[PDB]
């Protein structure tokens, strides 16, 4: 019953996103929302916003309204287009700073 | 039971019906018959190892196939000099089916 959504170009570094997505692999869909709800990390907000699209797609598109037999089948974060800007530092030099992005994908399947 | 035969500077353990791989016998075509000089015969508890007796025993075999083995890749090399020789080799073989071990 694989239904999935994903957010692309989400402005949070891939490692910081993986820190949270590695909690929500293979648990009940609702039980995963109740974990991202009470999660200190700031990446848990975009991730839970994608976890809700997956359930919304499962209910609407494929007519699996009951969102309690679902578990996270797949969830992974892919690298995204990095932005590059500079920073003035001591003695006239400049060090680069990369503002990384990520592509978060979540897949819910029936148990 | 089985007999020991030499086939081109190499010994083998052969029983009737075995298919064995030997150095190429260039003189023999597919289907030909070749006699191999036996070096030992073991038939149960009877071990025939007398060379005069064995000089008359010849194991008869049939040339089954002419084939080439796997390709071996060779490299000569010595550091800091630039010497490097690359070479390939496929050893050619003949498969023979042993048909008879005269007693």
């Amino acid at each position: 019953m694989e239904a999935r959504a994903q957010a692309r170009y989400i402005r949070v570094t891939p490692m910081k996103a993986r820190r949270v997505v590695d909690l929500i692999r293979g648990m009940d869909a609702t039980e995963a929302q109740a974990v991202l709800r009470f999660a200190p990390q700031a990446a848990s907000v975009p991730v839970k916003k994608v976890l809700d699209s997956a359930i919304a797609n499962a209910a609407h598109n494929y007519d699996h309204t009951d969102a309690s037999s679902l578990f996270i089948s797949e969830a992974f974060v892919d690298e995204g287009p990095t932005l590059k800007r500079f920073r003035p530092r001591a003695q006239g030099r400049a060090y680069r700073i990369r503002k990384r992005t990520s592509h978060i994908t979540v897949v819910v399947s029936s148990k | 039971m089985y007999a020991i035969v030499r086939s081109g500077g190499r010994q083998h353990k052969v029983a009737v019906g075995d298919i064995v791989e030997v150095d190429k016998i260039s003189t023999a075509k597919v289907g030909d018959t070749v006699e191999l000089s036996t070096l030992l015969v073991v038939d149960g508890d009877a071990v025939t190892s007398d060379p005069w007796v064995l000089a008359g025993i010849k194991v008869q075999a049939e040339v089954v196939d002419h084939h080439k083995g796997a390709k071996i890749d060779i490299l000569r090399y010595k550091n800091k000099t630039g010497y490097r020789r690359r070479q390939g080799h496929r050893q050619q073989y003949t498969a023979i089916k042993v048909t008879a071990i005269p007693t």
């Binding site: - | 020991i4 190499r10 010994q11 353990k13 070096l39 071990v47 190892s49 490299l75 000569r76 090399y77």
Partner: protein, 124 residues
């Protein structure tokens, strides 16, 4: 006539990295570091391939010596006796009898013992 050396250069890069599939770490991803190692892999192949002949003969002598000492004849003299009986049979297969067919190897030590001189240390 300008030549872009991409269709020609890649031909050897894939060849090396296909030979390098298996190496641990960085020797199996990077052409330069993989091509320094498949050179060593081929040289070791050459040496060990020519040096397993004495490797296997060592293993055969170990088995022949172990079986011969089970029948109370050291490998030192079991070979000499075999020479004096003209029953030369390769070590490859002379060690193949000791493992499987103990009787046949037992029958060959008998021949090697009787083909020896009575007193083995007296002047030839």
């Amino acid at each position: 006539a300008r030549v872009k050396r991409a269709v020609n250069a890649h031909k050897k890069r894939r060849a090396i990295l296909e030979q390098a599939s298996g190496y641990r770490g960085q020797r199996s991803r990077l052409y330069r570091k993989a091509k320094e190692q498949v050179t060593h892999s081929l040289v070791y192949n050459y040496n060990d391939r020519k040096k397993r002949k004495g490797d296997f003969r060592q293993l055969w002598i170990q088995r022949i010596n172990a079986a011969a000492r089970a029948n109370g004849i050291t490998y030192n003299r079991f070979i000499q006796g075999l020479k004096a009986a003209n029953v030369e049979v390769d070590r490859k297969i002379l060690a193949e009898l000791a493992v499987n067919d103990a009787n046949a190897f037992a029958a060959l030590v008998e021949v090697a013992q009787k083909a020896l001189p009575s007193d083995v240390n007296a002047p030839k």
